[PDB]
Design an enzyme around this catalytic site. Sequence first.
Site, PDB file in Angstrom:
ATOM      1  N   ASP A 183      20.866 -17.389 -35.012  1.00  0.00           N
ATOM      2  CA  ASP A 183      22.362 -17.798 -34.681  1.00  0.00           C
ATOM      3  C   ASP A 183      22.892 -16.928 -33.653  1.00  0.00           C
ATOM      4  OD1 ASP A 183      25.121 -19.289 -35.386  1.00  0.00           O
ATOM      5  OD2 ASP A 183      25.462 -16.943 -35.405  1.00  0.00           O
ATOM      6  N   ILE A 184      23.612 -17.097 -32.406  1.00  0.00           N
ATOM      7  CA  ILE A 184      23.882 -16.131 -32.045  1.00  0.00           C
ATOM      8  C   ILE A 184      24.674 -15.324 -31.868  1.00  0.00           C
ATOM      9  CG2 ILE A 184      25.617 -16.201 -29.226  1.00  0.00           C
ATOM     10  CD1 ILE A 184      23.747 -18.039 -28.531  1.00  0.00           C
ATOM     11  N   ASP A 196      26.956 -22.149 -32.461  1.00  0.00           N
ATOM     12  CA  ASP A 196      26.259 -21.517 -32.206  1.00  0.00           C
ATOM     13  C   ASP A 196      24.583 -21.456 -33.174  1.00  0.00           C
ATOM     14  OD1 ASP A 196      27.305 -19.696 -34.292  1.00  0.00           O
ATOM     15  OD2 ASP A 196      26.686 -18.401 -33.391  1.00  0.00           O
TER      16      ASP A 196
END
EC number: 4.6.1.1
Lengths: 330, 189, 189
Positions: free
Chosen positions: B20-21, B64
């Site tokens: 994930d970002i 994201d």
Amino acid sequence: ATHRLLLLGAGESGKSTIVKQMRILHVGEKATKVQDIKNNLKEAIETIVAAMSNLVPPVELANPENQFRVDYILSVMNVPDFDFPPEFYEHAKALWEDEGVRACYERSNEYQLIDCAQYFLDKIDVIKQDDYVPSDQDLLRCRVLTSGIFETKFQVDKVNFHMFDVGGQRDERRKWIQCFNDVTAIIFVVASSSYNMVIREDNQTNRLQEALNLFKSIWNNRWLRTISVILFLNKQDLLAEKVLAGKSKIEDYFPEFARYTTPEDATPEPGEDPRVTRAKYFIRDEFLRISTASGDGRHYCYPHFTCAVDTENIRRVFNDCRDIIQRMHL
Amino acid sequence: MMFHKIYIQKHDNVSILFADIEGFTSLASQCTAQELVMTLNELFARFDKLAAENHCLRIKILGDCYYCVSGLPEARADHAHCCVEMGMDMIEAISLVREMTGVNVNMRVGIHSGRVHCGVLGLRKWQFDVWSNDVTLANHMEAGGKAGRIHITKATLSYLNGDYEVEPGCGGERNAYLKEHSIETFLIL
Amino acid sequence: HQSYDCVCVMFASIPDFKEFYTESDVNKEGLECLRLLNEIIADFDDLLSKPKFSGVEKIKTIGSTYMAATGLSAIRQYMHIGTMVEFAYALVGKLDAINKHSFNDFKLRVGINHGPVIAGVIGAQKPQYDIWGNTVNVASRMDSTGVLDKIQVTEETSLILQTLGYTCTCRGIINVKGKGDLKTYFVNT
Ligand SMILES: CNc1ccccc1C(=O)O[C@H]1[C@@H](O)[C@H](n2cnc3c(=O)[nH]cnc32)O[C@@H]1COP(=O)(O)OP(=O)(O)OP(=O)(O)O
Ligand SMILES: Nc1nc2c(ncn2[C@@H]2O[C@H](COP(=O)(O)OP(=O)(O)OP(O)(O)=S)[C@@H](O)[C@H]2O)c(=O)[nH]1
Ligand SMILES: C=C[C@@]1(C)CC(=O)[C@]2(O)[C@@]3(C)[C@@H](O)CCC(C)(C)[C@@H]3[C@H](O)[C@H](OC(C)=O)[C@@]2(C)O1
Ligand SMILES: [Cl-]
Ligand SMILES: [Mg+2]
Ligand SMILES: [Mn+2]
Ligand SMILES: [Mn+2]
């Protein structure tokens, strides 16, 4: 050949009772359930004595002496790791020996009481021993709650059966779905005797009525349209007695009995009171009416008058089932 | 006839990768909505290129979140190395796409190796996916992971043949799912 | 891909199901679970094919969460906003139908939000149709912080439903991480 069987039915109907009657039939460790049997007994008496004062009217003791044993049996009700001292069995027995206590057991349809009460309370003196080892009838009468799903495998005439046992209470039914895909037949169990009694889950809903709706729920399921049902009208002994005694009648709870008469296809057991016939075939047709409605030859229903604790009746009927599995090419 | 046809099947000895970002919402404050979708697509198109090289199958993109697997459609005994090697390239690939954002973008990897069920649900608009407790875990490895680092499970290291140098990850002190299941985690160096 | 001026997004998860899901020799390690989930998603998919719902696009599903949208078919006027609600209800009706036969008390948790989005495709391995935007994660947040049986809407979304015939009640102030404290509302039945 392998035939996956699933037992369905309400609480205390006698599903687990049947699964044992396969270990008994088609399949040292007995020492672990002696513990569980004493618990039954404990829960059995303490339940009755508790029930006495919470009735309309309250049931009074026959012997004002016993009062202190009532005080005993009460004060020990919650005790966690109870060690069952010989006093316990003494007071326990004397309490069961009391008449008021029995007059309270005669009204055990009102409060909630496990089926094996009478059975175990009549053998306090047998269970009280430390050399004691439980017979196979003791093993059957023993009551433990089922929570989850249990798979015990067996074989009859080189034909493999998988039998699945599940919790029969409301909160437990959520797990049932996990056995719907690839099930050879359903075994629907019903406590035939429980017409004067209501379920534990709320203390109001009639047990049999519950069993009728639950059966209706399974008959008319969207993933059981083709899957056939072997109906096990169980607790026939308990029914027969309740009927014959004539205390709490059938038409006082299920009023539609007032019009019903005995059928012509009815094959009674050798020398069985017409009233017992009348009753169990009433209870039979109650589930058949539910089943003569929908389905239309896609799935089928199989009536059986059964007593799960009786190994002789169960051997008899489970063959009647084995035949019917092979017969319909399932 | 009764149910619908389940287009699902079990697979053992597989490795599930999640990432994930870090600080996407903080980033989503600066650039225009379309500028993000540019970067995102620029990133994952690159991510999907790396996948095939490391013998990895991309499952699904959740905004994201990117997550692929290793050990499909047919199996591999070398499956766990792949995800790790995938993460490796995934890590550096984000730093090169950091050039385009000009902002502090970072990935957070989480890998667990176990068993899955996989296929597609419903009837309309199918998308490939994976499900299991193990898959549930993989996501919490990502969640309780470390920035720019590759978070792996006890089970993932046992398939990893001790080829890479790890360190105590202490996922228990970062995620509530990782603690409440006594899972002991590590971090690639 | 292109952007839109006024889309309608819906996230509707069934939390109950995570705790429902279980892997075990008996249930074929969670296969018989998905199997019900299958049915559900399927039951929920059968709607898109209705007449009163034809102007509704199904986007994707995440775990056990239905994601959908309205108004992706243009160049009252928010007739589509209400349809999304009408659809959300129909989902629940279908879940209550499953509950009946599956012996469960599953509850849908819904979140609806409207506003500008960016549509289009992402990923090189297999391009899949998705929507991005503030609107989309806010609706997602109208779900994650939701209440079962109820549809949690933003004030903007609430105001329109009032002009369309729906009455509302204020939940209070939800913190939408990154965009701050926002007022939210439940729809009345
Ligand atoms: C102003 N926000 C945006 C502008 C343009 C495009 C997207 C967004 C946006 O906020 O996207 C959300 C969500 O819709 C988008 N998203 C997730 N799933 C989907 C999806 O399935 N379809 C479309 N978008 C999705 O992901 C983004 C955030 O991921 P999330 O998991 O909610 O927060 P994190 O905790 O992972 O990051 P952060 O706090 O770590 O910084
Ligand atoms: N007298 C008599 N008792 C029976 C008969 N069938 C079952 N019982 C007794 O009823 C009690 C309940 O049976 P049990 O098998 O435990 O129910 P169950 O349906 O498995 O219950 P559950 O696990 O769903 S909660 C036991 O004490 C059992 O011995 C029967 O035909 N006659
Ligand atoms: C569907 C059942 C179950 C338990 C199985 C599962 O592994 C998941 O599908 C994952 C983790 C898993 O499939 C990986 C993708 C994603 C999207 C991260 C899922 C969701 O978080 C699900 O949670 C939701 C929304 O139910 C979850 C956890 O649900
Ligand atoms: Cl019953
Ligand atoms: Mg049982
Ligand atoms: Mn993020
Ligand atoms: Mn995310």
